């Protein structure tokens, strides 16, 4: 069973899903206009059966309330602050973190705020300085939606299909439609303005293991660019690509994605640590 509960935080009321796994904790952070519900394959599958998988909803997303203060909360660094507060409330200082897309950018911002993080895996996330956005992301019509406040019904469907990929389910529309659109506009503006830490430098200098796993056919991430990003400690020494998967390989190719995730968790939590 999945343990659903809600936390009162300084950002608002944050919905949290937890698997019943007794093993080391894994925080999974969803993407723009998604929710932790998207991680059903991990929560309910072999990953969540072994490890304590924690999948919250960002403020303005899913079953969480809108942010008490959108100006504070709706930014990569503001979300990192919220997730850090969530983990402190849960009493967990040393989670492995998996971040999907926006969630990966949030994970990068969490490195400074959550120093006992045992590793970070990013999927759908090119670490980029603000001036590198065109290099890290592919141009297209669904990309413009990332920072667009108001979604038409058609926008909801287009965004859901491109970002979540195969298979499409009606329930995805409900998640995307709920999202506080102010969060899209503000986060995107602040990202381009460099209001938080330079993500290129952060990942270059970070000493914890960082794993990079992407679908080969995602419409958003420039994989070549990602394969050239400098990481302080790149897990298994390369960026990884899953064939026949798009932006969301954790749902499009769960077995192959879970192989990477499980191995990364094992590596970050069950090997003898030496500096
Ligand atoms: Ni979706």
Author numbering: 2 to 276
Sentences from the paper on this structure:
N-Acyl homoserine lactonases (AHL-lactonases) have important functions in decreasing pathogenicity by degrading AHLs. Unlike most AHL-lactonases, AidH is proposed to be a member of the α/β-hydrolase fold family. Taken together, the present results reveal the catalytic mechanism of the metal-independent AHL-lactonase, which is a typical acid–base covalent catalysis.
The biochemical data demonstrate that the Glu219→Gly mutation weakens the His-dependent solvent-assisted deprotonation and thus decreases the activity of AidH. Throughout the reaction, the carboxyl group of Glu219 forms a hydrogen bond to His248, giving it the correct conformation and the proper tautomeric equilibrium after it accepts the proton from Ser102.
